[PDB]
Amino acid sequence: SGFRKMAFPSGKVEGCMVQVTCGTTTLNGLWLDDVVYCPRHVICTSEDMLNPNYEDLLIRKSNHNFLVQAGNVQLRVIGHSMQNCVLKLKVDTANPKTPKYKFVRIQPGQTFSVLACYNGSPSGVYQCAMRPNFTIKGSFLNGSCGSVGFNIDYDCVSFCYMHHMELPTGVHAGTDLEGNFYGPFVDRQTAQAAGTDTTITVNVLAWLYAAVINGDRWFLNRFTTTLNDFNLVAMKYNYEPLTQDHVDILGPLSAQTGIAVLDMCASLKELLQNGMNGRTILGSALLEDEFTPFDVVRQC
Amino acid sequence: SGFRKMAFPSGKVEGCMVQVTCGTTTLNGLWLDDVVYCPRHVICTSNPNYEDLLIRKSNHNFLVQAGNVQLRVIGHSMQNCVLKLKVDTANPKTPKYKFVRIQPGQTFSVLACYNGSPSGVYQCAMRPNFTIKGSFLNGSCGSVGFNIDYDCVSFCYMHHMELPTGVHAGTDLEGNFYGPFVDRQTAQAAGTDTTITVNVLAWLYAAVINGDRWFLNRFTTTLNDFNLVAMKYNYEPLTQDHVDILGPLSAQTGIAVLDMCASLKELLQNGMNGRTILGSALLEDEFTPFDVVRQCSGVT
Ligand SMILES: [Cl-]
Ligand SMILES: [Cl-]
Ligand code: NA
Ligand code: NA
């Protein structure tokens, strides 16, 4: 029993973290085989942070301008290239600790673990979800850029996120490992703000199913709902729309617990109306939306 | 910025995890130097007296797998509730480490494992009732808890059982239980738990550092006055050493501990009036003062 935000074991990623330095700027890089991936804004200078022309800034660099340190070993950069907002540094040594890995671009609501690092050194690991507004609610300080987000289902590290910046509300924004930002953000210090965030309905329902599995039923009711009536209500609480894909996805948990998906939807509707009345669900007094249906099955 | 429940990077401990099988029982072991540590209840029962069951066992009754590799057991002894299996090979991945026993209220990371394979990492506090609110299914026994200071891993916890309330109990790595528990299938209950006052205060300081300030007021109180409130709300007593430990956070925010205690009083008496702190609608008590300092400053 029990239910917590569980990260994946971080060791396979720890052995890939390096420090990249350009001028006065140091951040983290990800060393897989003979390439180091990092945010391209490492080549920015204080002068042009509003409208950097990355192509012009990169053509001016030589390989020996990039200082890359893996622990106490300096790696030798033998080439470089930019892919979207990621810089790829070719190095003279393939990382002998490279795990089996792939690069995946995730959708909003998906979860992953972040290995927060500074100066190439891991600090901590935690779980995060990609919010509907394409931000993440992380824990980063300056120098954490290049820290990555990943899953390790089965045999194999799936890299899904690289950290690039912090938005004025205290939330965080970055790219996939092909260097495409999540959301409408750009790697410039021009004024930018996250869209209004919303709650990840399908994940809240998963977590209510987790609660039933863990043996708690107090929030159920004798009612059902149509999908459309559920969405009409839940939108008034800034919940994301629930789709037929989401209903399908919850099928397994529905079967495991014997509670129909749309009946659980009716329980959620009533929770939004009543609140908790001094009770908790899996130790929370809020409805939790950073566990996916897949996570619930993985942990329960 | 941001503030998350953060576990230590787990790779140093991942390379110490092995599978131990003996009889019908499979669970996890910790391989350090040439010894595998695991719960003594792995030994085959016939209400046990674990010494007599252990002479019946031959070294080759303990099957120890390190990944896809068998470790040869060449000896076995008991220390309190922990079995120590001498093996023929020192773990080449052994980190700098020591065995420590933690106090109630202190936090640590748990590397949850199944069949010797790390599955997940999360951060826990040793509760005042000497239990931990973990996430464990059958076969997690022998998973460990630890902190990291510099490069040194301090192992503090080994998992032995789940209690009827869904919380978990175990020992230090020297086999001494935390709490009034014994390792057998019997009528055992966690004592009434209480809230870790010094940690709630630390988390309110973390909130203030992250810009959450609505709960601050102009008022201050006395240790004796507050402890009467604490006692009423099933909060642990606050001691002068707790106040002194929070010194750094009081200096950094300009809110003296007894100033903050007056805030906690009002929160206890009046609730949070529909508001949240650091994304929580409850008062969170599994961050220590050191945890807040460490995360609001970036150690690796
Ligand atoms: Cl996805
Ligand atoms: Cl909460
Ligand atoms: Na292993
Ligand atoms: Na006050």
Curated annotation (Swiss-Prot), chain B:
Residues 1-300 are cytoplasmic. It catalyses: TSAVLQ-|-SGFRK-NH2 and SGVTFQ-|-GKFKK the two peptides corresponding to the two self-cleavage sites of the SARS 3C-like proteinase are the two most reactive peptide substrates. The enzyme exhibits a strong preference for substrates containing Gln at P1 position and Leu at P2 position. Changing residue 141 to A: Complete loss of 3C-like proteinase nsp5 cleavage. It comes from the Viruses. The active site is at 41 (for 3cl-pro activity), 141 (nucleophile). There is a cross-link at residues 5, 86 (Glycyl lysine isopeptide (Lys-Gly) (interchain with G-Cter in ubiquitin)). It is found in: Host cytoplasm; Host Golgi apparatus; Host nucleus. Residues 1-300 form the Peptidase C30 domain. Changing residue 138 to A: Does not affect ability to cleave and inactivate human TRMT1. Inhibited by pyridone-containing alpha-ketoamides compounds 13a and 13b. In turn, alpha-ketoamide 13b (tert-butyl (1-((S)-1-(((S)-4-(benzylamino)-3,4-dioxo-1-((S)-2-oxopyrrolidin-3-yl)butan-2-yl)amino)-3-cyclopropyl-1-oxopropan-2-yl)-2-oxo-1,2-dihydropyridin-3-yl)carbamate) inhibits SARS-CoV-2 replication in human lung cells. Inhibited ex vivo by michael acceptor inhibitor N3. Inhibited ex vivo by compound 11a and 11b. Changing residue 128 to H: In strain: Omicron/BA.1, Omicron/BA.2, Omicron/BA.2.12.1, Omicron/BA.2.75, Omicron/BA.4, Omicron/BA.5, Omicron/BQ.1.1, Omicron/XBB.1.5, Omicron/EG.5.1. 3CL-PRO exists as monomer and homodimer. Only the homodimer shows catalytic activity. Interacts with host FBXO22; this interaction promotes the proteasomal degradation of nsp5. Cleaves the C-terminus of replicase polyprotein at 11 sites. Recognizes substrates containing the core sequence [ILMVF]-Q-|-[SGACN]. Cleaves and inactivates human TRMT1, preventing tRNA guanine(26)-dimethylation of tRNAs. May cleave human NLRP1 in lung epithelial cells, thereby activating the NLRP1 inflammasome pathway. May cleave human GSDMD, triggering alternative GSDME-mediated epithelial cell death upon activation of the NLRP1 inflammasome, which may enhance the release interleukins 1B, 6, 16 and 18. Also able to bind an ADP-ribose-1''-phosphate (ADRP). This is 3C-like proteinase nsp5. The gene is rep. The chain holds residues 3264 to 3567 of 7096 of the full protein.
